[PDB]
From a paper:
Kinesins constitute a superfamily of microtubule-based motor proteins with important cellular functions ranging from intracellular transport to cell division. In the early stages of mitosis, during prometaphase, certain kinesins are required for the formation of the bipolar spindle, such as Eg5 and Kif15, which seem to possess partially overlapping functions. Kif15 has recently come to the fore because it can substitute the functions of Eg5, and may itself have potential as a prospective drug target. In contrast, Kif15 works as a dimer by crosslinking parallel kinetochore-MTs and we demonstrated that it does not contain an MT-binding site within its tail domain.
The structure of the Kif15 motor domain was solved by molecular replacement and refined to a resolution of 2.7 Å. Kif1519–375 crystallized in space group P3221 with three molecules in the asymmetric unit. The final model contains residues 24–375 for molecules A and B and residues 24–372 for molecule C. Owing to missing or non-interpretable electron density, several smaller loops could not be built and are absent from the model. Since molecule A presented better defined electron density and a more complete model than molecules B and C, we subsequently use it for further descriptions of the structure. The crystallized Kif15 construct contains the neck linker, which aligns with the catalytic core, forming a small β-sheet. Although Mg2+-ADP is bound in the catalytic site, Kif15 is in the so-called ‘ATP-like’ conformation. Although Kif15 contains ADP in the catalytic site, its motor-domain structure was captured in the ‘ATP-like’ configuration, with the neck linker docked to the catalytic core. Loop L11 is not visible in any of the three molecules in the asymmetric unit. In Eg5, loop L5 is known to be important for inhibitor binding, and differences in the length of this motif in Kif15 (in Kif15 this loop is shorter) explain why Eg5-targeting inhibitors do not inhibit Kif15. In addition, several other key residues involved in inhibitor binding in Eg5, such as Glu116, Arg119, Trp127 and Ala216, are not present in Kif15.
Numbering used by the authors: 10 to 26, 33 to 137, 143 to 257, 273 to 361
Amino acid sequence: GDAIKVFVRIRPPAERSQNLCLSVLSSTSLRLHSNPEPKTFTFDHVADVDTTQESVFATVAKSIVESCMSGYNGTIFAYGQTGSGKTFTMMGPSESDNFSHNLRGVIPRSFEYLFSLIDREKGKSFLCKCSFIEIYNEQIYDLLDSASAGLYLREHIKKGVFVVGAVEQVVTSAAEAYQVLSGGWRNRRVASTSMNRESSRSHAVFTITIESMEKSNEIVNIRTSLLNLVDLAGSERNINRSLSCLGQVITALVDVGNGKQRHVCYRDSKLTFLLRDSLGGNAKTAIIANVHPGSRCFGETLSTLNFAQRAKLIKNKAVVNEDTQG
Ligand SMILES: Nc1ncnc2c1ncn2[C@@H]1O[C@H](COP(=O)(O)OP(=O)(O)O)[C@@H](O)[C@H]1O
Ligand SMILES: [Mg+2]
């Protein structure tokens, strides 16, 4: 198959604290200063503390969206310790309403790009629906409906795992996509301040189904793509168990992809299950690993880099999800 794509993004430390623990050697390479012997890692890209939101999009998402348009499933998720910048990365800063639009993250920029590609693709027609859900403590909540209850996971023949009874909102424009996101991202923030004891333990999954029909009478070709944009629970220890499953799954896959054989429990967590195609399955996956340089993050940084390194070993098999009728 095709190896998944791993990127490392180093967020800048808070202003006015030296002594970094991490040095970027090149656009593919970084050195972790561990003693006595330093380690170096190689990824598809390494972005330093100055990297802009837009840069991130171009390096990571642009490709995924494109292959989405061509009918492949695709997935981007952000992994890393709490406070490493996952949310800033996929979403943007909070709290900034009347300004700093250049700060919006991957997900908003993805909407923009997707819809302009579509606009330009026009015979053929397009249909997009969004879902936004949150997994907290092995438990599902619908961000589009705060009154929803009893959400649960279910397999399909099409191979899709999905959340049964989650709102699927139809959107015809970036702008419409944007309130779906806004409304949900708020519910997420709003729930995190009582409990939902922390937002640092919840995974957030924003999904767009992208379905085109090329229809030249009588015949109709149908392409359908599932795009998952995920902001994970923080990876620090104690280690949240769904993330532990994530580690276990990544590991088993590697044993398998290169030799041996192994059992991979996708069903050990709602996350690994819902993401089953994203790992080793039918989809084009990109992982952004967020790390905070700086010396007191050394341990969690080391874990993140270790995790991401294996992840880069995994291979998916992704096909155009197609169909013909009429
Ligand atoms: N690229 C960046 N540039 C500047 N500040 C950032 C960047 N990424 C994150 N931050 C800031 O660091 C803090 C944690 O980022 P956040 O996205 O909340 O972390 P996480 O989602 O990993 O818990 C926030 O204050 C955030 O605004
Ligand atoms: Mg966060």
